[PDB]
Amino acid sequence: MYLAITNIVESSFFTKFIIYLIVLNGITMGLETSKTFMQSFGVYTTLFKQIVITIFTIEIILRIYVHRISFFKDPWSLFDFFVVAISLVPTSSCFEILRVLRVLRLFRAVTAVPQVRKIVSALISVIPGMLSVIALMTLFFYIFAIMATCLFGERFPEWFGTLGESFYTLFQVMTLESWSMGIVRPLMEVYPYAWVFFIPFIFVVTFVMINLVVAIIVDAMAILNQKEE
Amino acid sequence: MYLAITNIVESSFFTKFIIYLIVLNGITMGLETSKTFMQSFGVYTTLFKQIVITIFTIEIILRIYVHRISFFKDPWSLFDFFVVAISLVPTSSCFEILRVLRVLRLFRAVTAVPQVRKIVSALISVIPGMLSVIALMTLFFYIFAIMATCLFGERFPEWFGTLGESFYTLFQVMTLESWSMGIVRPLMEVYPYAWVFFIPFIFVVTFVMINLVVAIIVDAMAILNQKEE
Amino acid sequence: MYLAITNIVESSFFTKFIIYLIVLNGITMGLETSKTFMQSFGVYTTLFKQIVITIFTIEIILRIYVHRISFFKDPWSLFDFFVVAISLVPTSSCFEILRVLRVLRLFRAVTAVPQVRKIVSALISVIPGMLSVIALMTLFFYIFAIMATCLFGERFPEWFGTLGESFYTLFQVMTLESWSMGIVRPLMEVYPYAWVFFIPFIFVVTFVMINLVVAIIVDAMAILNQKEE
Amino acid sequence: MYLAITNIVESSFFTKFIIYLIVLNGITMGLETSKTFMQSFGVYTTLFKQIVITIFTIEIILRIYVHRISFFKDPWSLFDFFVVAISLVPTSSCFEILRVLRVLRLFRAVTAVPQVRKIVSALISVIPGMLSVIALMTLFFYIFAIMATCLFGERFPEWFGTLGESFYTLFQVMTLESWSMGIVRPLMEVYPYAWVFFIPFIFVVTFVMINLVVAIIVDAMAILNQKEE
Numbered sequence: 001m002y003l004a005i006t007n008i009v010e011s012s013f014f015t016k017f018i019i020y021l022i023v024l025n026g027i028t029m030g031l032e033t034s035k036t037f038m039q040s041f042g043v044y045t046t047l048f049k050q051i052v053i054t055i056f057t058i059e060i061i062l063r064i065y066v067h068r069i070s071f072f073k074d075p076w077s078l079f080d081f082f083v084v085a086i087s088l089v090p091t092s093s094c095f096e097i098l099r100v101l102r103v104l105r106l107f108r109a110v111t112a113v114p115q116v117r118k119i120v121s122a123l124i125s126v127i128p129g130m131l132s133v134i135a136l137m138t139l140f141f142y143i144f145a146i147m148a149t150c151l152f153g154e155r156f157p158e159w160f161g162t163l164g165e166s167f168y169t170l171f172q173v174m175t176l177e178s179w180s181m182g183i184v185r186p187l188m189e190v191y192p193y194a195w196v197f198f199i200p201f202i203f204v205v206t207f208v209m210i211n212l213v214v215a216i217i218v219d220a221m222a223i224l225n226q227k228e229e
Numbered sequence: 230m231y232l233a234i235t236n237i238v239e240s241s242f243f244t245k246f247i248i249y250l251i252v253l254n255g256i257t258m259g260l261e262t263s264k265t266f267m268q269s270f271g272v273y274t275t276l277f278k279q280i281v282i283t284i285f286t287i288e289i290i291l292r293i294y295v296h297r298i299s300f301f302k303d304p305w306s307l308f309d310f311f312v313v314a315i316s317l318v319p320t321s322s323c324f325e326i327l328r329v330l331r332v333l334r335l336f337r338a339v340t341a342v343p344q345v346r347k348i349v350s351a352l353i354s355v356i357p358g359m360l361s362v363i364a365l366m367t368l369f370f371y372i373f374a375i376m377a378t379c380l381f382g383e384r385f386p387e388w389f390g391t392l393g394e395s396f397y398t399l400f401q402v403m404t405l406e407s408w409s410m411g412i413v414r415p416l417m418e419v420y421p422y423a424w425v426f427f428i429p430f431i432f433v434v435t436f437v438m439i440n441l442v443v444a445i446i447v448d449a450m451a452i453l454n455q456k457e458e
Numbered sequence: 459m460y461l462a463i464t465n466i467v468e469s470s471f472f473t474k475f476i477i478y479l480i481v482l483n484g485i486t487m488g489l490e491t492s493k494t495f496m497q498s499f500g501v502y503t504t505l506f507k508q509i510v511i512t513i514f515t516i517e518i519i520l521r522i523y524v525h526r527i528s529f530f531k532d533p534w535s536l537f538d539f540f541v542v543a544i545s546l547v548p549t550s551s552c553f554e555i556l557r558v559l560r561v562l563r564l565f566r567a568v569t570a571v572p573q574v575r576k577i578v579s580a581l582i583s584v585i586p587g588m589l590s591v592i593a594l595m596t597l598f599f600y601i602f603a604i605m606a607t608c609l610f611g612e613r614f615p616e617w618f619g620t621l622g623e624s625f626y627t628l629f630q631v632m633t634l635e636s637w638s639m640g641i642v643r644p645l646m647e648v649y650p651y652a653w654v655f656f657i658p659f660i661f662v663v664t665f666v667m668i669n670l671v672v673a674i675i676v677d678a679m680a681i682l683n684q685k686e687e
Numbered sequence: 688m689y690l691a692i693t694n695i696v697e698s699s700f701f702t703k704f705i706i707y708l709i710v711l712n713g714i715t716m717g718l719e720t721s722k723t724f725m726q727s728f729g730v731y732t733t734l735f736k737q738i739v740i741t742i743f744t745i746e747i748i749l750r751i752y753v754h755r756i757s758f759f760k761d762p763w764s765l766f767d768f769f770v771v772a773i774s775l776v777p778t779s780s781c782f783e784i785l786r787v788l789r790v791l792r793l794f795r796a797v798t799a800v801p802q803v804r805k806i807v808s809a810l811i812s813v814i815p816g817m818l819s820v821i822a823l824m825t826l827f828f829y830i831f832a833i834m835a836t837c838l839f840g841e842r843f844p845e846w847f848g849t850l851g852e853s854f855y856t857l858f859q860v861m862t863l864e865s866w867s868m869g870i871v872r873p874l875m876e877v878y879p880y881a882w883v884f885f886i887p888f889i890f891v892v893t894f895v896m897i898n899l900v901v902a903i904i905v906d907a908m909a910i911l912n913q914k915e916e
Contacts, residue, residue: 030600033607033621094608101601107594114586119673128343136336142259143330149262150323163262168653172638175660180401181411182639195397202404210442213668215348218449220676224683225453357801365794371717372788378720379781392720409859410869424855431862439900444806447907454911488829491836491850552837559830565823572815577902626882630867633889640868671897678905682912 006066009059018059019106025052026100053090056099060084076105122220129215137208144170144201151197155190159183173198174205235295238288247288248335250281255329282328289313305334351449358444366437373399373430380426384419388412402427403434464524476517477564483510484558514557518542534563580678587673595666602628602659609655613648617641631656632663693753705746706793708739713787743786747771763792809907816906820899824892831857831888838884842877846870860885861892 028045031037071077083099090096111120145167152160159169173179187194257277260266300306312328319325340349374396381389388398402408416423486506489495521529529535541557548554569578603625610618617627631637645652715732718724758764770786777783798807832854839847846856860866874881
């Protein structure tokens with residue numbers, strides 16, 4: 001009946017069986033990289049793949065059939081429905097296998113007891129300031145990318161062509177690798193005063209990326225210092 | 230009258246209209262990078278640019294006409310007058326478009342509610358120590374640049390020529406990229422005991438740049454630990 | 459007798475003599491690098507090596523003979539038995555000399571007084587969260603290595619061949635050096651939309667490596683704020 | 688008399704005159720890099736240098752003559768006597784000009800009021816743990832340099848020759864630049880299992896360099912939490 005199926009979806013036996021077969025498919029996705037193992041057991045492994053994908057679709061849509069609107073409030077349901085919906089089509093560049101990320105559900109069972117609850121609570125509570133931090137960083141990258149494209153546009157072939165590639169190059173200047181010997185020394189061969197555009201930028205955006213660490217450390221100590229009042 | 234004009238400058242309708250047209254020309258500068266869009270809609274877009282910068286000078290000087298000395302106390306007024314006055318000349322290397330940075334005014338509206346007030350209060354209160362930190366860093370770069378120019382002056386063409394380029398090269402050694410395979414291995418081909426000039430330097434200035442992070446984290450927790458007394 | 463030998467193993471004279479000869483062989487392996495010193499005093503030096511490893515095996519197995527099961531509870535015993543048992547064979551790639559690491563026992567005597575007790579207590583207490591952090595990081599490297607092998611498998615010769623080398627290359631992208639000019643610019647010569655695989659990855663795993671620093675700083679202040687209640 | 692000379696050494700007029708001429712020689716050592724300025728005003732400038740260094744020796748030895756043993760307790764006296772005594776000889780590799788670092792004495796006057804007293808107190812109090820941290824790091828570099836020299840000794844020409852150069856190369860691996868494309872990819876062309884020597888090392892020593900930041904942040908908050916009891 002309706003009540004019996006809503007019991008049987010929440011059965012720990014069959015749910016742990018879903019976890020069993022999904023970590024099984026995770027390790028045979030680890031085995032698919034070894035081409036010889038796919039030469040040896042190929043039809044068996046693609047049978048494993050196709051069967052666990054169709055029964056994965058079966059169990060997710062049965063989770064819909066039991067909890068048509070009751071399935072809405074769970075962010076883990078947001079996670080697994082993202083995994084089903086975005087990775088529904090396999091006629092693409094083989095990237096179905098990110099559904100292995102479904103096994104992240106098992107790491108709910110480690111979030112409870114051994115002191116990582118405070119860390120994940122800090123990670124959850126750091127959201128409404130870190131989003132404003134990344135919006136400020138997007139504004140800085142926007143204005144500096146448009147300034148860099150107005151300056152170093154024509155005479156530079158590949159690092160400042162479009163808006164997206166100029167954003168990419170200034171992002172790589174933020175990641176702090178070879179801005180001198182990959183970006184500056186070709187640029188000072190033409191423009192002798194392009195250094196005064198980079199030197200504030202490498203300061204300000206890495207300083208904001210340090211301020212993010214400051215914000216998450218004070219957010220991870222606010223819950224600690226809550227315990228004295 | 231005079232009072233009515235001082236009311237009409239503070240009208241939320243026309244002020245939000247200024248914000249509307251400034252984010253409009255901000256995304257128009259986002260569109261100027263795509264040169265096909267400038268090929269198609271060019272006269273319209275440059276009409277947009279010229280008209281909104283003319284009325285931008287109009288509204289800023291009207292803000293002067295209403296608050297001749299009352300406009301002095303606001304650091305946001307310092308900001309917008311910097312943006313207008315330094316970027317008043319367009320007969321230069323195309324860099325007018327940093328007045329898009331004016332839309333930073335809109336991010337006052339996010340500074341109030343969602344917990345970033347403590348972060349920006351930490352960033353405001355970190356000033357009178359971080360200025361001494363950057364003065365110490367400037368002194369270290371000064372003495373190490375003059376020592377580097379006395380040592381590696383003649384026999385190296387471009388990394389230690391002037392004072393500014395030597396300061397630049399030691400700054401890049403502080404940014405920690407290819408000091409070995411871009412700076413050391415040509416240097417040890419001539420001077421076999423020039424390593425002991427770098428190895429203290431890469432330690433001391435990166436250690437001070439870590440101490441800056443220490444100072445801003447303790448300043449971002451001082452406001453937190455103030456709330457128990 | 460049995461009791462007298464269990465006293466003489468704990469004799470401070472002979473135990474500090476073991477410490478004397480083990481720091482002696484530490485600086486002897488510091489001297490083995492200079493091959494002229496091995497040309498001059500070589501037979502004496504290898505005599506020193508063979509005699510101290512023979513008597514080292516003697517004293518460790520005498521520590522077993524006195525404390526057959528009483529020797530179990532010490533993690534320092536785990537350390538020295540690892541050093542003896544894993545490096546018992548010298549017919550290998552010359553790597554016996556990591557038994558010099560035995561002198562780490564002497565740094566127990568600095569762990570007591572001068573304020574490093576709090577640091578080593580933080581390092582001991584940071585274990586049951588940092589293990590979950592490294593398990594999460596291993597899962598991320600697993601899924602991103604298999605996704606990288608699906609995407610950049612065939613047409614790239616050495617950076618994405620097996621599973622281990624693809625894991626290695628994405629680890630090097632985590633170490634943040636030349637992902638652009640060593641990994642991206644050959645990749646964008648073929649795939650024009652392979653950047654959107656890297657740009658989330660370099661964000662998420664370096665952000666988790668920053669979160670590790672957050673966890674160890676709040677663990678090093680929890681013992682501090684313990685002292686007010 | 689004797690008392691009057693011990694007053695006249697502490698005269699604020701002549702002491703501020705020493706500070707005046709030492710910042711004067713600081714800025715003209717900033718000017719010596721411009722060789723045209725040395726072409727124009729050269730004899731005057733070297734006259735300035737020679738006269739103020741001989742009167743610098745005069746005032747330092749007068750500080751000795753007034754306070755023969757009373758000059759011992761000051762670490763600033765340790766600083767200025769280091770500056771005079773180690774840099775007394777000018778017949779060397781031109782490196783006299785580090786006595787410009789004497790102007791650091793003026794930054795005592797900024798250590799008092801504007802909140803940096805807590806930062807420099809944290810920097811003073813971080814000593815007896817950070818020395819043990821750097822001793823541990825020296826031991827790690829010692830054992831890993833000897834292991835790297837035993838493994839990659841013969842077939843590698845310049846990165847693993849002596850003990851000092853192998854220490855230097857593993858230090859550069861700690862500085863995290865081109866360990867892959869400068870150190871690994873030549874090494875995996877011969878040894879296919881040398882990666883398992885690097886991958887623990889780049890983890891452990893950068894993790895200890897992060898733990899240094901942890902120690903200095905908790906030391907900079909211990910003085911903060913001192914103010915509640």
